[PDB]
Assembly symmetry: D2
Homo-oligomer: 470 residues x 4
């Protein structure tokens, strides 16, 4: 009668360690894996303990549909404080005048953030233009084939990508300007998932204005860098700025949408000023358009992250991020590796392994087997996305642990050694060998000691640094 009811009350108060050992262990194993591993995936990073604590707060429970002042349900005086605070810090972090800029912090993640904007400004079967996927774009910028639309962006809207110049490795802004005149985009996307150089926002803006389109920036990857002022801000030229709250920003998984406010343009003769209406449209698209109940526990984490983002320690961190990157870049350069575009203005670099006579697809799996985390990526000029020639390497992940130039140079050597091992297996399994067979020879018995020998040395090195979290 009341024996089991007490057990119920005990259940909701019971610690994870006891309640779910099965899941508890998986988290422990992952925590370990992250610790002994070298993280070089550009989109990776380690959240602060302060942010993680906010995610476990009672803020999960409160359903606060709508916005501060326009709430559907009542009893939100504290959620209002939080959401209002978060967006106040968001504007501060990027030095934005509240009268010139507004921000929406409800987006569940980065992808939903972008889609909300399209839905709001472009509208069904509208025209969008973004960096091609194999050229360093992101799916949310549109992606389709001769057979079908794959990305949601491509499905409901009409996309046609602009490309990078295969020779220089830089974005071909000239061709974009030309195609834009024939396609008449409604919105142009200024952002990249795998691009190692600063975007010419001023140039793009002009191209957008020429065609009467919006300029949306997706600073997902460089959000941390722009905040610290380590890289040129896109806010000066863009109309809308979408961003993820994780990656270089080191927040929890969430998204944000910055939009212009105030005067859009004026009539020379009548003096009648036309004001921006992005605030209304964008907000309406997030709710009640797409999303429902805001994830207040995440908004908190974001708010916490934004405070840390405005500290000097962060500013230093972001500079060290870039500094490390050049160290890693030149270290590999001097080793004979062809960096795409000959260096990086930001945190990441794209290594074209054709320089060593191999591809990223095979190098990826080998590096992984050695606790070296990174991802393959197609290089400018690749005639096949199935066999990518390059590897994407970012520094923000390791930098957060305390890695410095000298260390990233030691990492560079570990990476090379992985490529080496790759070239051995590649030559051993023949030339007409498939990726299927390569994976088998790798996990094979012949190279089992070699892989382990490196892995153990990589792990022992990573173990020397702290792992933010706990």
């Amino acid at each position: 009668d009341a024996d089991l009811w007490s057990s119920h009350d005990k259940m909701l108060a019971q610690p994870l360690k006891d309640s779910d050992v099965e899941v508890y262990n998986i988290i422990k194993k992952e925590s370990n894996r992250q610790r002994v591993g070298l993280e070089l995936i550009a989109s990776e990073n380690f959240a602060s303990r302060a942010v993680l604590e906010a995610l476990g707060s009672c803020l999960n429970n409160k359903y606060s549909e709508g916005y501060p002042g326009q709430r559907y349900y009542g009893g939100t005086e504290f959620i209002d404080e939080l959401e209002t605070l978060c967006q106040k810090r968001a504007l501060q972090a990027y030095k934005l005048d509240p009268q010139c800029w507004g921000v929406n912090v409800q987006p569940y993640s980065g992808s939903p953030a972008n889609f909300a904007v399209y839905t709001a400004l472009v509208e069904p079967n509208g025209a969008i233009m973004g960096l091609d996927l194999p050229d360093g774009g992101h799916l949310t910028h549109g992606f389709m084939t001769d057979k079908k639309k794959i990305s949601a962006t491509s499905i409901f809207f009409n996309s046609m990508p602009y490309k990078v110049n295969p020779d220089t490795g830089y974005i071909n802004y000239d061709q974009l300007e030309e195609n834009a005149r024939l396609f008449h985009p409604k919105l142009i996307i200024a952002g990249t998932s795998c691009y190692s150089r600063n975007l010419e926002y001023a140039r793009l803006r002009k191209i957008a204005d020429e065609n009467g389109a919006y300029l949306m920036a997706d600073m997902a990857h460089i959000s941390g860098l722009v905040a610290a002022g380590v890289v040129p801000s896109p806010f000066e030229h863009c109309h809308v700025v979408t961003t993820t709250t994780h990656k270089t920003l080191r927040g929890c998984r969430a998204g944000m949408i910055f939009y212009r406010k105030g005067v859009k343009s004026v009539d020379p003769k009548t003096g009648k000023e036309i004001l921006y209406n992005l605030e209304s449209l964008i907000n309406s698209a997030v709710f009640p358009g797409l999303q429902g109940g805001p994830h207040n526990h995440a908004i908190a984490g974001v708010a916490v992250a934004l405070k840390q983002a405005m500290t000097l320690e962060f500013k230093v961190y972001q500079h060290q991020v870039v500094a490390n990157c050049r160290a890693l870049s030149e270290a590999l350069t001097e080793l004979g590796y062809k960096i795409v575009t000959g260096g990086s203005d930001n945190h990441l670099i794209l290594v074209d392994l054709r320089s060593k006579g191999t591809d990223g697809g095979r190098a990826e799996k080998v590096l992984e087997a050695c606790s070296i985390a990174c991802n393959k990526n197609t290089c400018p000029g690749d005639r096949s996305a199935l066999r990518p020639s390059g590897l994407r390497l970012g520094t923000p992940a390791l930098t957060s642990r305390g890695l410095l130039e000298k260390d990233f140079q030691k990492v560079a050597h570990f990476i090379h050694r992985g490529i080496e091992l790759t070239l051995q297996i590649q030559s051993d399994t023949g030339v007409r060998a498939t990726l299927k067979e390569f994976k088998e020879r790798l996990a094979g018995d012949k190279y089992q000691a070699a892989v382990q020998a490196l892995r153990e040395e990589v792990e022992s090195f990573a173990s020397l640094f702290p792992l933010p979290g706990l």
Copy 2:
């Protein structure tokens, strides 16, 4: 040189309490606010500590785009174990045969989960039919006006709602079957945000098959009940079942999508069997269609919740949820309140305040001022959505704290006293008064003591019960 670099390392390992007192205090205030208040919002509930500890895990860091064995990035052997485990438990919680059913657990929340399905199955400007918003539907089921499409569902797809019978209060399935033949839906939604009775899924399935459409169930609200077997399962008749992982399920904020697998139909003559292709379509729609990197930390929280959901304590909980609702319902009934449809087969009820001579819009604000959390809602027969007559009251939130029949009856009294105070203020401020003026008189000095008197008594009563997941 190295003085500030050490401070950097200290910052990432620094506790929230020290790192951000400003946010830390807001959380404490909220945590205190939830404690002393009676939560009666149907969609509300309290997550278990175990779940809350999973969200703060290092799982936040790993980017695992794709699905188990189909991952874009490497080093996911532990994320795979987690995602594979979660979805295995998901199928178990609802006693589903893995050969007959599959599930995607990546959706960031409920809404994204629904939109994912439409994208995959219905496709741009396809026809969708759902319960009307003011009749207890949800925005994601579609909503528009004579002037614009408001819901993303309506914006990108061609939607037309089906309505509840204003007299009885039950969904008018007959009109639906009729309009369906005209509209030719490609998919019909069997779900509600504010409905107090069990859906006739069998009926709906027939109507769907007649027009060659899919039947998608949105068990967001009754997900918990269905799991414990307290309410008839929609899995028997529907093709797809979307759900939120919170509310009655008591998980963290996230969504799931269940889809049919195996044989769809067979040719009587040729014997050639056609198989379902929902798995591929739905999965492709979630990724790389709509979402990006899975929120693994939430996927863990869902997994944890799903294990608790399969326990006997949960089963008892859910039974107590419904039991409490009947107690609250009949308690208000006996006080003369008109419950829409005269009761409820589930956790929530819809109280029509026209019975006491007022509206939900005003009662909402008064009850709130007294720490009585609930939301207004239009009743069947309301000629104006600006002045809703009804209140939505749910029991899952309080029942989680430990409330029982007898307690919910006491709550029923406290609520009544709230309606009373509402009636006094309503008559005091006149009849032609606006909601604007009402709010002012409420917060006014004349009723400042009355409100406080009730508030303090409610909070003192609310304090007697525990609150899940603290320090």
Copy 3:
């Protein structure tokens, strides 16, 4: 060198009779077929010789893209007179104040005319409501199935039809009003292909305004009647009126689009009167949106037809059209045939053959074999559009030849005899394939011939407009 160049000049000036005997013969055969046949298809009629002469004019050559004074090419002073005249007459025919009403006369036909309006006013994937197809609607009013969108209207625009009350036979305006509040139509269509009663335009207007939609009337089938004032005008309540120039109007194949002009409403507070903008939108949609170079030769025929439509002879014609319809109706009623809705306010009627124990699909083919031209059509309450129960019978065609009440009663008898032959064939034998076969059979051929010859010999007694 110049021997064949002379032949070329001879070719262009050579008569059809000589230039293309093959085609010349087909025309003669058809002309004959029409002469000896009894035309009872509601959408049919016979154009005046005057109109037919206009179609062969040199107006075929001029390319006059755009509108009067807004032409893309020059040298259109005479085309401008024509088009301007035509639309001037169009407004007169329906007693429409030019300040309150405008009209576009370029549409190649009725369907394009309708689509032109949707593209202009409704816009891609915009809601549209019309009478359901099997209930007497038209394809252009929207039509779809579970499998697919079939009509262009349905493919590009959201369409959801309203239905006729299966019991009474009248349109169910109540259900429309109800579904309208859910669907939120941008444009409602008040027109019918197979409907025997006057539309409650006032009622429909109220429903349209309630949902802030446009009321578009498709008077294709009643354009002639409304012109003569035999039937209540849709112009008093509608925002836009589309119409074909043939059928009851006895013009050549073409379409027109009438639209409201002037003040739409006057805002209460501001007081700034808001004006209609249909003229621009609709015109823009016809060109340069949808169509290209106008078919001035048809625009002439239309103009000619419109002048004839304003004569007393025409007025008497249309009255006689309705008169004949009543006679035909009651003549079949008295023979026991069930007329859907029990009569007709206009030119056509729907005969429910279930009263005789058969279907339209089986009666159509028999009647055809007897030179009796008519078409099958689903009755209200038909559970299968594959086996339609009714026949659609119209008077405008024969009436033009000179047929009168007494004659249409003799026609009624001829029709009944066709139904008998149908029933007798139906009794012996089954799928339609088997039926058609039995009809072409060895024993009913005579009975049929006995009828055909008698029908033809009767039709042969009346003049055939054209030549």
Copy 4:
């Protein structure tokens, strides 16, 4: 009583007002020099067919698939027409089919899109200012103007402003990005032959359809004066007037039979254009066919298979050269100096003026032609070129020597234009009193020359 007379009364009596307008136009066409490429004079045989009782018969559907009965004679007609259509272009009935119901050329194209591309699908065509046609797609930074652009996705390909030739290289490049479903090989104002083989290669590479719009060259291709697009294209749309000298109507030719085969399984995949395209015309877009037009078309198709027509089409091309070089030698700059077809595009910047002004002056002199933007024009509001075609006049009996005398009459108009020039104000000065005698003096001399030739029709 009197009503029976009315339906049998002649137009001359029934409607004098309309009757006169027709006479005035017939006169105007007789005394004017028609040089609009899209113009032509239909034979008297075709015109008589348009007035036939065929106007009355509603024959919805296709032969053997009709909705209404009593169509045995319409079936013969429509079947004959499409039989002749295939003969005219030497097309094997097993390899090719044709739909002859389209009310005009524009509807013909749209039908194809509706059938193959499917709503919000991607098509590509020559840019409008580069000599494309509206139906091939046309939009701006502000709105979609052409029906094609509205319901579908269009992204045009351009002509090389330097050479004047279509830039196939850039098309091949952009195509890889836009993923067209259908590419359009057709022009309204393009002076050279299309590289269909090339286009086909580009289409196959992207897995698209190759639709040819031979509206302007339909007559030329029929006679074999110009390379046929049927050898490389999947679908061929066309108008039945213009160079074909039929009444206003359209046709749609489509491939039939085997599309491709599987090397291993030997399983052959067959084309399905016939069904889709037909279904799109009806019951998709159109309603009751215009049988009176279908007859005229059939008549024209017979004339198109005669030797007299063949000669005509060659004289058409021949005249064009004579006119091209006659203006070349007078110092005028022809874009792509030389034409492989009936029309040419005269760039008036070589004479220090624009087409927009020359058009209005030439018109005032009974010289019919139209302005058109040249490759390299930075403003479509001030077009630099004039489009001049020979099929119209050639049909009257005009020969090389005559078109040279025409070339002189045209030049004199350009002079008169340059005098007035040294657009609103220009029009006023033209109609002004100062140049009233000069215009009349040339007009009377132009008209007196045209009067010397016969006018097909009556």
